């Protein structure tokens, strides 16, 4: 009854994801795969010190054959891409090689895709693997949504568990905040502000969204890489799956009619469980929000159609 | 040393279950038990104090009122339960008298923390504690409808086959016969329940929702009718409230707090969504209610005041 | 990959065990069985409030058929027995009925026995069930040993994790402390005392053991029942099994040559895992300790031989 | 408010990994990052400060020395690493100078907590911190051999296929080349390892035990040889030590502390089993050693004093 998570890519993202998981105690077994076998052995050696400190996760450097019994394969590997276009091509090539090797092992679990552009690469994984959409999941806007709630929690001086807001769309420039669905406790945000934040403005809220949208940029400009944040997001998603939570997370999943979208992976609130994505939830959007969501879909499709038939 | 301490007054089924939940959840550093029967309470503490060699480090002992001096929280579970030969008012008078003595003994020790009241009727006795202690309303909290709301969300989580953390509903008012579900504010994820049902619960009926609320309202009665007593449920609610205070959450819980104008109510403790933290109840939140909900909440308040009026 | 624990008996012990487990979050599913079906439904109703408070264990009142997929069946039920002899007979009768119904369901997991006399009833369960010894385990001296370590931890003003001592034998009047194997950190207790407790005496240690031996008596004389303590012990044992710990616990297991004992369940240090008891550990005993252990075995056998062929 | 705060000085791989381990383990309320490059450290803090919306409530920010005033613990990971063109003494001198400035800035803020030193050479720099701070030895602790001991127990747990909590062995001495396993005190459950092996490990050899110790001693070298750096391992050890202090465990950890007569050693920090609690190191425990072990421990102490002597 043991669980196993395989991590492809032991760069900053994969290694931080591994370390978050070991400290949170989410899976029984974690297998690390990457190109440089000697290096990956070193990565596993450094990571494999949890047991004598009360963190029982077993961690080792493996190969694609170890995916056969894996519940989840998390892909963090990628190219390291001057232009966005060049990078997507390079990453699509990398993903074909990775996904083919995973499927060749007999793997029949769930893919989590972390590598950017995450929506495009989640779609790639779905195409390359031949798996049902429910079992191929991009991290999507999970982190954007977390940041959105965290900033609102600070703005309202209330527990983040009582902030209810989503970021939808591409994980990137065309993401949108769904203000029409944003609630503080059970009340629409505007009503809550009328009562408890009377000096608050639409300016403040717009600034909050800009802070979310540009967070990675502002981290990267200071320390040259980001990884801890997405690691926490990936661990959250992994727990929803392994613990069969049936909880709502904004992940990248395949549209098959929802929001009048089709044939695109995009970030939407979705029910996540041991089944993967059970349902892409359709929430009511105002006209401007729906327009922004379709713009984001169109944007993604313009990246996808040069790569996929 | 930055340690936390909770004192539990009353080591009957509710107080003992609360202590056991707390020990197993690892919420406080120190737990002191106080009750009338000193020898029994020593035995209660002995039985409860086995967490340490099993990796639950809470220190548990039988104490006295002087041990409240350094306590962060005093949880009162002691009191009589209404018996056939007496009215609701007769019970209020009796328990109010009991609380006067308990609160005087607590304050006499130098205590300067937060009271959590669990004894029924919890709204009336929380108001009594506020009056007797002289403490600010923020620091006197009745468990109120915390368990009713938890049951409400749990039932809805099963009805919709979704994580309970994605169910957003409140039970408000008196903890008892006159409580009300606030269906106009009930959301599944971000959406009003009516919209969610339209989309994802086609075989659902408003009758199912009424059944859910009846199940909440009558839960204690149905447990008691089967096993003669109830205590595990409220123990979990008390532990939840304790955690919000000790961990300084500033989260929304439906607890009993003093109305001073909220919902056009005054001079009454009643169950409402409230921000709870290390400061106690920071704020009673006013959520918009429909006309029928507001009417029910005022009826609930009136009902409470009818049994308080000949004493307070 | 879900785990299931069935509890037979929803009196004080079974209910406290259920409540400890729900709060500790050890198993996915807990099924309650007892004689009064309506009462047991009530017991389950009161216990089943963890979910909305973040304790995800599913709890329900069931029947013997629910044991089919159970990983563990914990027996806490018993008679409520003026003389010790009358009580053992009554409990043996009860256990035959319980064990037959459990085996009739197709159950193929592990039995934990909590009901006293626990060694005799563990042996009964082994006989009645026909299961391998590894999978029939009495709580034994798990609680006695916990008390022993806790009292020593207070005596030496050190973390209980650094106290290493065992209570062996019958869970009852003929239990023994194994002082020759008692260590504070890695040092024999006498050496540690020479250095850090110079005014300590054998008197103090004897008093500590007497306090362990008579703990239940002193609880019962004050509040008329004991249950929280054994609940914590049962939860500890359950975690060792479900988490496949391979940890050393003093449980009641069958002797098949160990300590030159045979055909008796008795409390000894044992390795406990998902396999049940992998090994009864033989530790070196001094002559007096070995004599006490054989006296305890003889005592148990005198209770057993009137009941079992 | 009873909150705990840990300040980390140095936000390179070790300090950042320590912060991330702590956030995920939920050990402290507040974590302040200090390092030389202010803009980078702001970025480090930003990346690390995403625990809250994922249910890890630790507050994390980039700060300055003034934020040490209320800190319970300051963890120093900053310093240079020895480079080809310099000796061990040259590194000691350089890092001792670095520590003088860091410690002066910490004390200048009004700090009155406990120092944990992680920077290598950890025994020498812990002694330096003790000297520079003016604090009691109890409150200045080097991580010492905590990770070596953890690795030792882990390897033995795998060798015997038993829970690591039932393996009882220590690595003592300098954290480095001259550390020693104390095989004469190594126990599997309550029994000496030789006895346990006689009974339950028939294919076992003393050569396997030597191999295990070599694996411990050379672990960092073998990690670095493969991936160029090591940091996750020590981060877990630092989190373990932090937990013992903040949770007031009074548990035995092999950490670096001042010798004042123990093991017939004086005027040196060295790794020994020690009682660790909210008070810091309460006691360096003296365990009986065989003649060869005592000789090795004194050799280790001598080795440390040889590189300290031309500076202290």
* Nearest CA among D139, D138, D142, D113 for reference residue D127: D142
Instruction: Count the neighbouring beta carbons within 10 Å of the beta carbon of residue A254.
Output: 22
- In sequence order, what are the beta bridge partners of C29? C4, C58
* Catalytic residue flag (residue D175): yes
H helices present in B76-231, as ranges: 88-108, 122-133, 146-160, 193-200, 206-217, 219-227
Q: Is residue C220 a contact partner of residue C226, using CB atoms and an 8 Å limit?
A: yes
* Nearest CA among D200, D188, D7 for reference residue C278: D200
Instruction: Count the neighbouring beta carbons within 10 Å of the beta carbon of residue C140.
Output: 30
Q: Residue D285 and residue D296: Cα distance in Å, rounded?
A: 17
Q: Is residue B109 a contact partner of residue B69, using CB atoms and an 8 Å limit?
A: yes
> Are C130 and C165 in the same domain?
no
Dig out the tokens for D312 from the structure. 């202290």
Q: Residue A49 and residue D147: Cα distance in Å, rounded?
A: 9
> Are B204 and B110 in the same domain?
no
DSSP state for residue A28 in the 8-state scheme: S
Cα separations in angstroms, D227 against A6, A16, A36, D214, D223: 19, 15, 10, 20, 6
Instruction: Count the neighbouring beta carbons within 10 Å of the beta carbon of residue A35.
Output: 12
* Nearest CA among C132, C77, C131 for reference residue C106: C131
3-state DSSP assignment of residue A133: helix
**Cα dihedral sign for C282, C138, C277, C257?**
positive
Instruction: Count the neighbouring beta carbons within 10 Å of the beta carbon of residue C85.
Output: 12
Q: Is residue D267 a contact partner of residue D281, using CB atoms and an 8 Å limit?
A: no
Alpha-carbon torsion, ordered B186, B192, B198, B203, to 10 deg: -10
DSSP state for residue B189 in the 8-state scheme: T
CA distance A283 to chain B (A): 7
> Are B150 and B253 in the same domain?
yes
- Interacting residues of A39 by C-beta distance below 8 A, sequence separation 6+: A10, D226, D227, D228
* Nearest CA among A124, A21, A6 for reference residue A65: A6
B273–chain A Cβ distance below 8 A for any pair: yes
Set of chain D residues whose Cβ sits within 8 Å of the Cβ of C166: 190
> Are B66 and B156 in the same domain?
no
- Interacting residues of D164 by C-beta distance below 8 A, sequence separation 6+: A51, A52, D153, D154, D157
3-state DSSP assignment of residue D300: helix
Q: Residue B118 and residue B114: Cα distance in Å, rounded?
A: 13
H helices present in D70-136, as ranges: 88-108, 122-133
Residue C95 — φ and ψ, nearest 5°?
Answer: -65, -35
Q: Residue C166 and residue C69: Cα distance in Å, rounded?
A: 34
3-state DSSP assignment of residue D102: helix
Dig out the tokens for C174 from the structure. 């003929």
User: What is the bridge-based pairing of β-strands A72-75 and A4-8?
Assistant: parallel
Q: Which of A1, A51, A245 to mutate to test the interface with C (most CBs of C within 10 A)?
A: A1
- Interacting residues of A84 by C-beta distance below 8 A, sequence separation 6+: A117
User: What is the bridge-based pairing of β-strands D5-9 and C176-177?
Assistant: unpaired
Instruction: Provide the CB-side half-sphere exposure for B279 (13 A, CA).
Output: 9
- Interacting residues of C42 by C-beta distance below 8 A, sequence separation 6+: B222, B223, B224, B225, B226, B227, B228
Q: C140 preceded by cis ω (within 30°)?
A: no
Question: In the β-sheet with A110-113, what is the strand arrangement from edge to edge?
Answer: A58-61, A29-33, A4-8, A72-75, A110-113, A136-138, A247-256, A262-273, A276-280
Transcribe B29-69 into DSSP letters. SEEEEE-S-HHHHHHHHHHHTTSGGGT---EEEE--GGGGT
Q: Is residue B114 a contact partner of residue B139, using CB atoms and an 8 Å limit?
A: yes
Record: contact A2-C3, CB cut-off 8 A: no
- Interacting residues of D115 by C-beta distance below 8 A, sequence separation 6+: D73, D74, D75, D76, D103, D106, D126, D129, D133, D135, D139, D140, D141
Record: contact C223-B48, CB cut-off 8 A: no
CA distance D132 to chain A (A): 31
Instruction: Count the neighbouring beta carbons within 10 Å of the beta carbon of residue D98.
Output: 18
Q: Residue D185 and residue D212: Cα distance in Å, rounded?
A: 16
Q: Is residue B259 a contact partner of residue B270, using CB atoms and an 8 Å limit?
A: yes
Total residue count of chain C as it appears in this document? 309
3-state DSSP assignment of residue C243: coil
- Interacting residues of D79 by C-beta distance below 8 A, sequence separation 6+: D10, D95, D98, D99, D119, D120, D125
**Cα distance from N-terminal residue to C-terminal residue, chain D:** 41
Choose one of C91, C110, C140: the last residue of a domain: C140
3-state DSSP assignment of residue C245: coil
Helix (H) or strand (E) holding A144: helix A142-156
Dig out the tokens for A66 from the structure. 């170890």
Dig out the tokens for A62 from the structure. 């493996």
Q: How many domains is chain B partitioned into structurally?
A: 2
Q: Residue B179 and residue B145: Cα distance in Å, rounded?
A: 8
From B48, B52, B230, residue closest to C228, measured CB to CB: B48
CATH of the domain at B58: 3.40.50.720
Dig out the tokens for C254 from the structure. 């069958």
Residue A60 — φ and ψ, nearest 5°?
Answer: -150, 155
Q: Is residue A124 a contact partner of residue A92, using CB atoms and an 8 Å limit?
A: yes
Choose one of C91, C106, C140: the last residue of a domain: C140
> Are B150 and B134 in the same domain?
no
Query: In chain C, after which residues is the C-to-N distance over 2.5 Å, breaking the chain?
Result: 80
Q: Residue C141 and residue C253: Cα distance in Å, rounded?
A: 11
Q: Is residue B191 a contact partner of residue A181, using CB atoms and an 8 Å limit?
A: yes
Burial level of A224, CB count in 10 A (0-12/13-18/19+)?
A: exposed
Q: Residue A286 and residue A181: Cα distance in Å, rounded?
A: 9
CA-based nearest residue in chain A for residue B289: A187
Q: Residue D2 and residue B215: Cα distance in Å, rounded?
A: 41
Q: Residue A103 and residue D206: Cα distance in Å, rounded?
A: 45
DSSP state for residue D279 in the 8-state scheme: T
Q: Residue B179 and residue B202: Cα distance in Å, rounded?
A: 29
Q: Residue C292 and residue C288: Cα distance in Å, rounded?
A: 6
* Nearest CA among A147, A302, A270 for reference residue A213: A147
In degrees, rounded to 5, the angle at the alpha carbon of residue A217 between the alpha carbons of residues A216 and A221 is 115
> Are C271 and C296 in the same domain?
yes
Set of chain C residues whose Cβ sits within 8 Å of the Cβ of B24: 19-20, 23-24
Radius of gyration of chain D (CA): 19
Q: Residue A117 and residue A300: Cα distance in Å, rounded?
A: 9
A35–chain D Cβ distance below 8 A for any pair: no
Q: Record the resolution, in angstroms.
A: 1.6
From C38, C219, C232, residue closest to B46, measured CB to CB: C219
Record: contact C2-A1, CB cut-off 8 A: yes
Dig out the tokens for D301 from the structure. 């102490």
Which structural domain, as residue segments, surrounds residue B53? 1-144
Annotated active-site residue in C49, C171, C227, C295: C171
Q: Is residue C242 a contact partner of residue C21, using CB atoms and an 8 Å limit?
A: no
Record: contact A150-D24, CB cut-off 8 A: no
> Are C73 and C25 in the same domain?
yes
> Are C134 and C148 in the same domain?
no
* Nearest CA among B179, B168, B217, B125 for reference residue B297: B179
> Are C180 and C156 in the same domain?
yes
Instruction: Count the neighbouring beta carbons within 10 Å of the beta carbon of residue A301.
Output: 17
3-state DSSP assignment of residue A169: strand
Dig out the tokens for B29 from the structure. 């550093």
Cα separations in angstroms, B155 against B210, B214, C62, D38: 12, 11, 20, 51
A106–chain C Cβ distance below 8 A for any pair: no
Instruction: Count the neighbouring beta carbons within 10 Å of the beta carbon of residue C194.
Output: 12
Alpha-carbon torsion, ordered D212, D218, D219, D224, to 10 deg: -160
Rounded to 10°, the helix B122-133/B88-108 angle is: 40
Total residue count of chain A as it appears in this document? 309
C245–chain D Cβ distance below 8 A for any pair: yes
- Residue keyed to tokens 């407790």: C197
3-state DSSP assignment of residue A252: strand
* Nearest CA among B19, B10, B136, B7 for reference residue B72: B7
C132–chain D Cβ distance below 8 A for any pair: no
User: What is the bridge-based pairing of β-strands B171-172 and A163-164?
Assistant: unpaired
Dig out the tokens for B62 from the structure. 């039988």
Record: contact C243-A2, CB cut-off 8 A: no
Q: Is residue D183 a contact partner of residue D209, using CB atoms and an 8 Å limit?
A: yes
Q: Is residue A24 a contact partner of residue A49, using CB atoms and an 8 Å limit?
A: no
Q: Is residue A116 a contact partner of residue A94, using CB atoms and an 8 Å limit?
A: no
Tell whether residue A273 is among the known ligand binding residues: no
Cα separations in angstroms, A85 against A123, A252, A303, D297: 16, 20, 8, 61
Instruction: Count the neighbouring beta carbons within 10 Å of the beta carbon of residue B37.
Output: 12
> Are A157 and A251 in the same domain?
yes
Q: Residue D226 and residue A251: Cα distance in Å, rounded?
A: 35
> How many helices and strands in chain A, by DSSP H and E?
10, 14
User: What is the bridge-based pairing of β-strands B140-142 and B114-117?
Assistant: parallel
Q: Is residue C209 a contact partner of residue C148, using CB atoms and an 8 Å limit?
A: yes
Q: Is residue D4 a contact partner of residue D69, using CB atoms and an 8 Å limit?
A: no
Choose one of A97, A116, A140: the last residue of a domain: A140
User: What is the bridge-based pairing of β-strands C187-188 and C183-184?
Assistant: antiparallel
DSSP state for residue A93 in the 8-state scheme: H
> Are C176 and C97 in the same domain?
no
CATH of the domain at A291: 3.90.110.10
Dig out the tokens for A15 from the structure. 């290694």
* Nearest CA among A134, A138, A6, A21 for reference residue A69: A6
- Interacting residues of A13 by C-beta distance below 8 A, sequence separation 6+: A76, A114, A115, A227, A230, A231
Q: Residue C132 and residue C135: Cα distance in Å, rounded?
A: 6
Instruction: Count the neighbouring beta carbons within 10 Å of the beta carbon of residue C199.
Output: 6
* Nearest CA among A84, A88, A15, A22 for reference residue A56: A22
Q: Residue D258 and residue D221: Cα distance in Å, rounded?
A: 27
In degrees, rounded to 5, the angle at the alpha carbon of residue C188 between the alpha carbons of residues D289 and C254 is 130
C50–chain B Cβ distance below 8 A for any pair: yes
Dig out the tokens for C62 from the structure. 């069931």
- In sequence order, what are the beta bridge partners of C33? C8
Record: contact B287-A187, CB cut-off 8 A: yes
Q: Is residue D284 a contact partner of residue D261, using CB atoms and an 8 Å limit?
A: no
- Interacting residues of B34 by C-beta distance below 8 A, sequence separation 6+: B7, B8, B9, B10, B11, B41, B62, B63, B64, B65, B67
* Nearest CA among C104, C112, C77, C82 for reference residue C92: C77
Q: Is residue B273 a contact partner of residue B170, using CB atoms and an 8 Å limit?
A: yes
Cα separations in angstroms, C114 against B115, C171, C293: 38, 11, 21
Radius of gyration of chain C (CA): 19
Q: Residue B171 and residue B153: Cα distance in Å, rounded?
A: 10
Q: Residue A83 and residue A75: Cα distance in Å, rounded?
A: 22
CA distance C13 to chain B (A): 12
D300–chain A Cβ distance below 8 A for any pair: no
Dig out the tokens for C209 from the structure. 């053991």
Q: Residue D102 and residue B88: Cα distance in Å, rounded?
A: 68
* Nearest CA among D25, D112, D21 for reference residue D71: D112
Report the b/e string of B84-108 with b at 16+ CB within 10 A. Answer: eeeeeeebbebbbebbeebbebbbe
3-state DSSP assignment of residue A309: coil
Dig out the tokens for C185 from the structure. 């950190």
Dig out the tokens for B211 from the structure. 């059944």
Cα separations in angstroms, D218 against A53, D148, D211, D212, D222: 20, 10, 10, 10, 6
Dig out the tokens for C8 from the structure. 């037979």
Record: contact D190-C269, CB cut-off 8 A: yes
Report the b/e string of A116-141 with b at 16+ CB within 10 A. Answer: bbbbbbbbbbbbbbebebbbbbbbbb
- In sequence order, what are the beta bridge partners of D126? none
Residue D204 — φ and ψ, nearest 5°?
Answer: -80, 155
- In sequence order, what are the beta bridge partners of C59? C30
User: What is the bridge-based pairing of β-strands A187-188 and A247-256?
Assistant: unpaired
Record: contact C3-A3, CB cut-off 8 A: no
> Are C104 and C164 in the same domain?
no
Solved how? X-ray
Alpha-carbon torsion, ordered C49, C51, C53, C54, to 10 deg: 150
Cα separations in angstroms, A196 against A189, B182, D115: 10, 21, 43
- Residue keyed to tokens 């092996």: D197
Q: Residue A101 and residue A70: Cα distance in Å, rounded?
A: 14
Dig out the tokens for D280 from the structure. 């810091």
Alpha-carbon torsion, ordered B37, B39, B43, B45, to 10 deg: 70
Q: Is residue A292 a contact partner of residue A176, using CB atoms and an 8 Å limit?
A: yes
B261–chain A Cβ distance below 8 A for any pair: no
């Amino acid at each position: 009854k043991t669980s196993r998570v395989v991590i492809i890519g032991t760069g900053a993202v994969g290694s931080s994801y591994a370390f978050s998981m070991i400290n949170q105690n989410v899976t029984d077994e974690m297998v690390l795969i990457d190109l440089d076998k000697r290096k990956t052995e070193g990565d596993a050696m450094d990571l494999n010190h949890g047991i004598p400190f009360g963190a029982p996760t077993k961690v080792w450097a493996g190969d694609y054959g170890d995916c056969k019994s894996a519940d989840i394969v998390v892909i963090t590997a990628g190219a390291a891409g001057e232009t966005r276009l060049d990078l997507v091509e390079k990453n699509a090539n990398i993903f074909k090689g990775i996904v083919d090797q995973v499927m060749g092992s007999g793997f029949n679990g769930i893919f989590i895709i972390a590598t950017n552009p995450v929506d495009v690469l989640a779609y790639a994984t779905w195409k390359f693997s031949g798996l049902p959409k429910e079992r191929v999941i991009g991290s999507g806007t999970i982190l954007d949504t977390a940041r959105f709630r965290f900033l609102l929690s600070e703005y309202f001086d209330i527990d983040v568990r009582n902030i209810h807001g989503y970021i939808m769309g591409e994980h990137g420039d065309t993401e949108l905040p769904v203000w029409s669905q944003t609630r503080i406790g059970s009340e629409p945000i505007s009503r809550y502000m009328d009562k408890y934040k009377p000096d608050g403005s639409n300016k403040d809220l717009d600034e909050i969204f800009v802070n979310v949208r540009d967070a990675a940029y502002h981290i990267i400009e200071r320390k040259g890489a980001t990884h801890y944040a997405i690691a926490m997001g990936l661990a959250r998603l992994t727990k929803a799956i392994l613990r069969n939570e049936q909880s709502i997370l904004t992940v990248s999943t395949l549209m098959e009619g929802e929001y009048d979208l089709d044939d695109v992976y995009i970030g939407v609130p979705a029910i996540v469980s041991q089944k993967g994505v059970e349902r892409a939830i359709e929430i009511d959007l105002n006209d401007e929000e729906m327009k922004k969501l379709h713009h984001s879909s169109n944007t993604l499709k313009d990246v996808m159609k040069p790569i996929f038939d």
